[PDB]
Amino acid sequence: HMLKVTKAVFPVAGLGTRFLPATKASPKEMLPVVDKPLIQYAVEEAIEAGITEMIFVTGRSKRAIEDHFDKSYEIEAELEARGKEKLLSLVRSIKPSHVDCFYVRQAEALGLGHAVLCAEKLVGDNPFAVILADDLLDGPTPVLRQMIDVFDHYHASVIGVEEIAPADSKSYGVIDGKRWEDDLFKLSGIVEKPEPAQAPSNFGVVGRYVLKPKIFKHLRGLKPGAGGELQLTDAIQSLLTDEQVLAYRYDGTRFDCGSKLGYLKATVEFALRHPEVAADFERYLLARMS
């Protein structure tokens, strides 16, 4: 009976400088897409993939994350005294009954690899998901669900990837491997933010991972890599030196809300999806562009 994936680690401890001043007292993963934080979309994707344990690695402004998911006595009493039963149900669904939220600190912002390592003793000897909420994903089925299906079948760590334009390679981890299926690669290498001429493929890492606990030994051995940060990507490279690691070309779509441009695109996309504002927003865009 092989181990199942029931834990997800959400690093939300970066500096968020691209979104200052708004990220002064709240992480970039709390930025709202019209009315819902990025991190809530990510947790909802984990929940639909069968994850019941959410581990948040917090840095500066841990309270914005904690108070979003933890029960608020005040808000429930206020909504109940006003008979706003639909809104009350909406607020309670932020953390459904069987979902646990656990918190650990990254005191120093030393990079994504270091953030994941802070969660080591909460994950224990278990496979686990890593979800970067600034990668806002959708798909016919949740991307993490697709990836856990690959993990259960091949019993290897799985890295989510998409095709990128070569000029953007300095924004991504970039994989090097052998094709097994139309959507599946066996990795022989992975590099963080290569120059376009040094990129080994057109396949960039998106912020979804299903990792075997062996990754933690390889995170512990990291030295500073790109940008002086301890890179998860270099631990994956070290890991594939010792055991099999796969990359999965997921079925779906991505907004890079780690950049203002992508955040703007996500906002526009959300708007057209909601009938409360869709028609009116359509009309405004047409008159506004002309």
Ligand X SMILES: O=c1ccn([C@@H]2O[C@H](COP(=O)(O)OP(=O)(O)O[C@H]3O[C@H](CO)[C@@H](O)[C@H](O)[C@H]3O)[C@@H](O)[C@H]2O)c(=O)[nH]1
Contact positions vs ligand X (CB under 6 A):
11-14, 29, 57, 59, 106, 109-112, 115, 132, 134-135, 172-173, 192, 204-207, 231, 233, 258
Q: Which does 206 bind (CB under 5 to 8 A by kind): a copy of itself, ligand X, Mg ion, none?
A: ligand X
User: Using CA atoms, how far apart are residues 101 and 55, in angstroms rounded to an integer?
Assistant: 6
Pick the closer one to Mg ion by CB: 156 or 235. Answer: 235
Shorter beta-carbon distance to ligand X: residue 12 or 247: 12
Could you tell me the smallest distance in angstroms from the CB atom of residue 140 to Cl ion?
19
CA dihedral 69, 74, 79, 80 (to 10 degrees): 110
Identify which of residues 15 and 124 has a Cβ nearer to a copy of itself in the complex: 15
Residue 29 among known ligand-binding residues: yes
Longest dimension (CA), the chain: 62
Closer to Mg ion by Cβ: residue 43 or 206: 206
Rounded distance, CA 120 to CA 111, Å? Answer: 15
Choose, by CB under 5 A, the member of 22, 166, 179, 181 that binds Cl ion. Answer: 166
212 binds, among ligand X, Cl ion, Mg ion, none (CB under 5 to 8 A by kind): Cl ion
**Partner that binds at residue 249, options a copy of itself, Cl ion, Mg ion, none, CB closer than 5 to 8 Å by kind:** none
Residue 218 φ/ψ, nearest 5 degrees: -75, -30
Told to check if 37 binds Cl ion by CB under 5 A, we report: no
Tokens of 57: 């690695």
Q: In terms of CB distance, is 74 or 195 closer to a copy of itself? A: 74
Residues forming contacts to a copy of itself in the complex (CB under 8 A) are 15, 17-26, 30-32, 34-37, 40, 60-61, 63-64, 67-68, 72, 74-75, 78-79, 84, 87, 90-91, 94, 109, 260-261, 263-265, 267-268, 271, 274, 276-277, 280-281, 284-286, 288-289
Nearest Cα to 111, choosing from 67, 44, 189, 173?
A: 173
**Distance in Å, CB of 175 to a copy of itself, minimum:** 26
Tell me the binding residues: 11, 13-14, 28-29, 111, 134-135, 173, 192-193, 205, 233
Q: Name the residues that contact Cl ion, by CB under 5 A.
A: 3, 14, 16, 18, 127, 165-167, 212-214, 255-256, 259-260, 262
Q: Which residues belong to the annotated binding site for Mg(2+)?
A: 134
